[PDB]
């Protein structure tokens, strides 16, 4: 599991998930890109 911000500061974080896990990730105005294994990167953007 890997995630990065779609702005000036990406702040890349990586971790090997093996057991049942719950992850809370903050989504900034620029956007957050999350890659879960061999799947295509999931894009997320803030709203109202």
């Amino acid at each position: 599991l890997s995630y990065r911000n779609m702005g000036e500061e990406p702040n890349y974080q990586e971790e090997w998930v093996m057991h049942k896990k719950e992850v809370v990730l903050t989504v900034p105005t620029e956007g957050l890109e999350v890659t879960w294994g061999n799947n295509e990167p999931y894009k997320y953007w803030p709203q109202m």
């Binding site: 090997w16 890659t35 294994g37 061999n38």
Partner: protein, 144 residues
Amino acid sequence: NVYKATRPYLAHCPDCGEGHSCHSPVALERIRNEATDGTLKIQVSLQIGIKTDDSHDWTKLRYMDNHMPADAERAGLFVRTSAPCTITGTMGHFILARCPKGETLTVGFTDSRKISHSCTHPFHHDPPVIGREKFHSRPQHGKE
């Protein structure tokens, strides 16, 4: 038959069986694991696919037996880590095999006198993680 001129020899082993070290004709040299798919390139002391008279025969094996080289069977040859390995190529000192998760590599065979010799080397086998998932069994259909 390039095996007419070439020949075989002997070497040393750190484990011939039950933790005892000896001079094995199936002695391990170099175990290459550069292939990302999981294929292992094993270098052995004996020669496979060649006879004592220097002639090509896929069903025959050439090993060193007390100063003189002797013939053996290809079917008798085996590779194992924790469970048996599938041999996917044999030519001279080289053996190609796909092995499951293991800590020690074992390579053996059976001679003409019906006596089995095997060499064991400590090797941490664990096919790298090709992709982003650490699976064990290979799928027939998936991501290329």
